[PDB]
Structure 1
């Protein structure tokens, strides 16, 4: 799952994903 893998390897994205999930985090950072 590209988005989870990518988001995990950005501390701010991983942090955000802890609250809102990786799809929503990835979209905020890499939209």
Structure 2
């Protein structure tokens, strides 16, 4: 797994994850590999 969540921070879709946990599950929802 490489730096992929860099874009996640921009899109509120998975960015909201960092609000209560901020791990990867949210990003995996629309990608898969972390």
Q: TM-score range by the shorter chain?
A: 0.3 to 0.5
Q: Which structure dedicates a bigger proportion of its chain to helix?
A: 1
CA RMSD of aligned residues (A): 2.1
Question: 4+ residue runs of structure 1 moved beyond 3 angstroms?
Answer: none
Q: Which runs of 5+ in 1 are unaligned?
A: none
Distance 1:28 1:17 in 2: 14
Q: Which runs of 5+ in 2 are unaligned?
A: none
Q: TM-score, normalised by structure 1?
A: 0.46
Radius of gyration: which is bigger?
Answer: 2
In terms of mean alpha carbon deviation, does 6-15 or 18-27 score higher? 18-27
Size of the aligned set, in residue pairs, is 31
